Amino acid sequence: SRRARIERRTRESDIVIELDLDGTGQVAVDTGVPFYDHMLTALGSHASFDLTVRATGDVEIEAHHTIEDTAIALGTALGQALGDKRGIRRFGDAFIPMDETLAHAAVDLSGRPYCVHTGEPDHLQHTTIAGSSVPYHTVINRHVFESLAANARIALHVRVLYGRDPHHITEAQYKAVARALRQAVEPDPRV
Amino acid sequence: SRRARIERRTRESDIVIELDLDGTGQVAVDTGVPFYDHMLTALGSHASFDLTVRATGDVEIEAHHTIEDTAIALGTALGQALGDKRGIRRFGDAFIPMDETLAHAAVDLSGRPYCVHTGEPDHLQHTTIAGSSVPYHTVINRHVFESLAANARIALHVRVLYGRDPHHITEAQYKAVARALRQAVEPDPRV
Amino acid sequence: SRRARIERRTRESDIVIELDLDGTGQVAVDTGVPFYDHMLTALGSHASFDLTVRATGDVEIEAHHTIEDTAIALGTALGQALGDKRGIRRFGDAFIPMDETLAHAAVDLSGRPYCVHTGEPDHLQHTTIAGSSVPYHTVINRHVFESLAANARIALHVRVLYGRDPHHITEAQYKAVARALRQAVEPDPRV
Amino acid sequence: SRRARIERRTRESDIVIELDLDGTGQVAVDTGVPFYDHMLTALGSHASFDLTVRATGDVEIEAHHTIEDTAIALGTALGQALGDKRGIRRFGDAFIPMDETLAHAAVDLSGRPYCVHTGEPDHLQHTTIAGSSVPYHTVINRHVFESLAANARIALHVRVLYGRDPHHITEAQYKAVARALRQAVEPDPRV
Amino acid sequence: SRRARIERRTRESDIVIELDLDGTGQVAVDTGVPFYDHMLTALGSHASFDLTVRATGDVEIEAHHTIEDTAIALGTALGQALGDKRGIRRFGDAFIPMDETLAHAAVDLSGRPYCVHTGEPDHLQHTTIAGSSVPYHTVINRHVFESLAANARIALHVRVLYGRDPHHITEAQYKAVARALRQAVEPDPRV
Amino acid sequence: SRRARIERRTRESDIVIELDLDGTGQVAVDTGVPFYDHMLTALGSHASFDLTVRATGDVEIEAHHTIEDTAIALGTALGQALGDKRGIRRFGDAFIPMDETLAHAAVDLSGRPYCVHTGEPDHLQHTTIAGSSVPYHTVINRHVFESLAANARIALHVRVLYGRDPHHITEAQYKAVARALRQAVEPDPRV
Ligand SMILES: [Mn+2]
Ligand SMILES: [Mn+2]
Ligand SMILES: [Mn+2]
Ligand SMILES: [Mn+2]
Ligand SMILES: [Mn+2]
Ligand SMILES: [Mn+2]
Ligand SMILES: [Mn+2]
Ligand SMILES: [Mn+2]
Ligand SMILES: [Mn+2]
Ligand SMILES: [Mn+2]
Ligand SMILES: [Mn+2]
Ligand SMILES: [Mn+2]
Ligand SMILES: [Mn+2]
Ligand SMILES: [Mn+2]
Secondary structure, eight states: OOEEEEEEEOSSEEEEEEEESSOOOOEEEEOSOHHHHHHHHHHHHHTTOEEEEEEEEOTTTOSHHHHHHHHHHHHHHHHHHHTTOTTBOOEEEEEEEETTEEEEEEEETTSOSEEEEEOOOGGGGSOEEOOSSSOEEGGGHHHHHHHHHHHHTOEEEEEEEEOOOHHHHHHHHHHHHHHHHHHHHSBOTTO | OOEEEEEEEOSSEEEEEEEESSOOOOEEEEOSOHHHHHHHHHHHHHTTOEEEEEEEEOTTTOSHHHHHHHHHHHHHHHHHHHTTOTTBOOEEEEEEEETTEEEEEEEETTSOSEEEEEOOOGGGGSOEEOOSSSOEEGGGHHHHHHHHHHHHTOEEEEEEEEOOOHHHHHHHHHHHHHHHHHHHHSBOTTO | OOEEEEEEEOSSEEEEEEEESSOOOOEEEEOSOHHHHHHHHHHHHHTTOEEEEEEEEOTTTOSHHHHHHHHHHHHHHHHHHHTTOTTBOOEEEEEEEETTEEEEEEEETTSOSEEEEEOOOGGGGSOEEOOSSSOEEGGGHHHHHHHHHHHHTOEEEEEEEEOOOHHHHHHHHHHHHHHHHHHHHSBOTTO | OOEEEEEEEOSSEEEEEEEESSOOOOEEEEOSOHHHHHHHHHHHHHTTOEEEEEEEEOTTTOSHHHHHHHHHHHHHHHHHHHTTOTTBOOEEEEEEEETTEEEEEEEETTSOSEEEEEOOOGGGGSOEEOOSSSOEEGGGHHHHHHHHHHHHTOEEEEEEEEOOOHHHHHHHHHHHHHHHHHHHHSBOTTO | OOEEEEEEEOSSEEEEEEEESSOOOOEEEEOSOHHHHHHHHHHHHHTTOEEEEEEEEOTTTOSHHHHHHHHHHHHHHHHHHHTTOTTBOOEEEEEEEETTEEEEEEEETTSOSEEEEEOOOGGGGSOEEOOSSSOEEGGGHHHHHHHHHHHHTOEEEEEEEEOOOHHHHHHHHHHHHHHHHHHHHSBOTTO | OOEEEEEEEOSSEEEEEEEESSOOOOEEEEOSOHHHHHHHHHHHHHTTOEEEEEEEEOTTTOSHHHHHHHHHHHHHHHHHHHTTOTTBOOEEEEEEEETTEEEEEEEETTSOSEEEEEOOOGGGGSOEEOOSSSOEEGGGHHHHHHHHHHHHTOEEEEEEEEOOOHHHHHHHHHHHHHHHHHHHHSBOTTO
16 A cells, blocks of 8 residues: 655645555646646656645745645655555656657656756746646746655656647656656566 | 834825834735735845835736835835934845755945846846736846835845746845845944 | 558559557568668567568659658558557657667657657768668658658657667667557556 | 754664754764764864764775765754754855865755755866875765755755865865854844 | 576686576675675666676776676676577666766667767766775776677667766666666567 | 054054954054055944054055055954954854945954955056045055955955945955954854
């Protein structure tokens, strides 16, 4: 049983995470930031987690605090669910082609906490993905990966090899992290 | 007693400031611009002021006029509360690390009115921080510091040594100004 | 059963493809272009397909039309054999070292049709691989990958990281596509 | 009482740390790496900690594992001794001139875990400080700061403004971290 | 049974290797060069080999001859244990994130003997990793990979994508080779 | 009692210094060089010294000899008044904003004698500040700092971060040294 429930209540937000590493992609995410819900739904589904995320926070300011608190809580849940990390593959990686974009992620689950994020085009440091609700500033992508790695206590390297569309570039990164995690958490039949 | 109440009524906005320099961080800010409320709440709290800001203005146009009128009124309140500036430290400075960002501010409270703002990455001249309410254009950060210094009649130098996230970069600057002010307004036991 | 038979008759060529995704590498290719037969034999074998290709076309002009019609028909066969794509790994990738050459391919089988081909040395835009029969112009490599992706309706990214010999560079790419496809078409035990 | 005892036993090393934040610089360090003992003795003394470090590890390989495990354990001890961090200055910074070298550090003790290390001359990525015992490779300086910040859960920025001698450059950084920590952990009379 | 015992006696060194490809990571390495023992212990463990290495050589000169003779003997053992290479995956690759470092290796076990080693920072051509025993000059890393590939008769490509610490950079490469070998030697259920 | 009286009689000048480190800024300076009197009055006042300087020298030549002899004598007085330097803060630093100029100084009072002076605009190597009396050549600023550090036996680093006006640039440096000294000489309540 590799499950964790994390509640995180801060001045800025209130987060509940329920995570099972050995899931079938039963995922429900509601953070008040719909593009971020899309990304975390992709992360949970492609990782073959079962994942519920419920977050409410100070989106009148902008999505940053809620996004960051959610990534800290999710990181914490992943570290807790992994437990002693005995008998797992430990390392995982995945390439995600998405139209013109190619992204990659590599993880070491028993590595020191560390994040390296490279290759994202410079326009993503000031791009907004905006719909009818609270928008998503792509400059936060790096912050999400850094917060996940710091709180799960894993080494997580995310690369954009190339790409143009900010939705493709962002979604391919979340999916690459997800499939890298899926590989790394699997039981290793030789260990 | 180092207190000031400033009312500023213009064509564009209506501002009330109540400031006490010798506070404990009892801060309440409501300007209709929630990211700016976040920044001024950080400024008042980290300066160990007691500070109430109530502003209403022409946010149908954008936040600029309300932000500027608020910074003019706050500047005026700080100059008035300082009075003759006798027996204070006068100079103050502070570094604020915020994740990848490092900011600094230095003040001379008995200096000629002057603002120098350096180091902010070029992407902040066209970045928007957007939530569910009125957004905040980071190009205004310099205008806020310039308006505070011009109306408090102080020398205020704000630097970004490095950083990436526009929320970190902006918040670290407001906090650095706040902690520089906190040091400078303190009684000097030798003067 | 993941099988397809495609017949494609054009003004330029006549193609029959029989494909089984769940094969053991029983491959027979005869297109009149022997280097291309070598490449498609490598593709079918390394993908663990069972694959028969029979093509005749206007090789008095040059191999282009036959190569392109063959890749369109093969693409079509792969899309048809995949069917609804339920319960498969969907993503796959492979590195192929071949002496001095390193190539890579990544696929998303449920991705929009898209091909990105990068890294091939500039000399391959005007190189000929020539024997005793119809020669193979390596400039067509990109066209083969583009035609496969457009007609299978998959995302296919092919990279040459480095290399020198045009036969190594071309063969490593065909093998990398093959092993990426082999991984992606496999049943996924968790989906 | 702001004290912590951390025991850390790994495959590579065995570490005992006893730390008191409210000390008078009573410091005893023995790691088997005498230049590192010099640096941690400087850190504990200039921070006005009371600090005992006893470490034994696989120095037949080189100092890296012992240095890293020691910095992880020390980081952990500092986080534990800080407790809820109520009523402290929280931010601290210090400049350390050492002959030709000027270094600086800035800390936020209630900041997310983060380390930024800048300005160290490129020759320190391959410099050895060697005596009659186990030598110290200055490339590890960054690793020590990163491990301290990750495990104390603080924001720590270390800068070399300029310098030449690798012993001055390294010692000035350790002292700057120490005096920044000393300022940040102090009770804040207004908070 | 995929086992080999190689004895190699030269003017410079005396080497005994016992290798089983189908192991559980039971590894014991003693070459007189403790950092190299660390690296080969990592290689054997991460490859899920059972591996004993006993080497004595002319370390009064430096580690080079012993390191090279050990890598030649280990290469020879891997080629012998692989036998006819029937029914194996043949290709393997692995990414290894290690703090700031990312390394990769790709292998073709039925490829011509060939080694390509790219991306290692220039400082590793003159870096020493030194403890209390015989030191390890990182310039030899390339020689180890070249000697393994030449004597196992495999294609081995090792890349450093980025990194700074010479111990991380070296260890990540040895681990990447190890996990690439582990994948490539595995029985292939379709071949 | 931290007081010193230094008399220095040379071929070029006759200097009397009376210094008390624990003063209230009772300062009287008369060197025959009125801009230098302004600078030393600023230094003594901002350091919270009590300081009398009386110097007469060969100003028919230019101010250099008198300025240098005065700085040597003042340095000597500061070293003597500091005595054994027991129980003091030892390190100090200060930023001084002066209109467009920002200067900084950092000191180690128990450091080896050393001066590093950086950042002063190139026009100050040939600028004169001229009134109705003996003028002041700003090229001497570095010489004053070097002479103070050499004779007080302290490490003194003075930086101009930016500036334009030679009077602002010079005065901000003297004030920064003064406030850095004020911090460093203070009793340290923990040492
Ligand atoms: Mn943040
Ligand atoms: Mn989408
Ligand atoms: Mn305006
Ligand atoms: Mn914030
Ligand atoms: Mn065509
Ligand atoms: Mn790659
Ligand atoms: Mn061939
Ligand atoms: Mn390490
Ligand atoms: Mn600075
Ligand atoms: Mn020393
Ligand atoms: Mn050799
Ligand atoms: Mn190691
Ligand atoms: Mn002179
Ligand atoms: Mn003046």
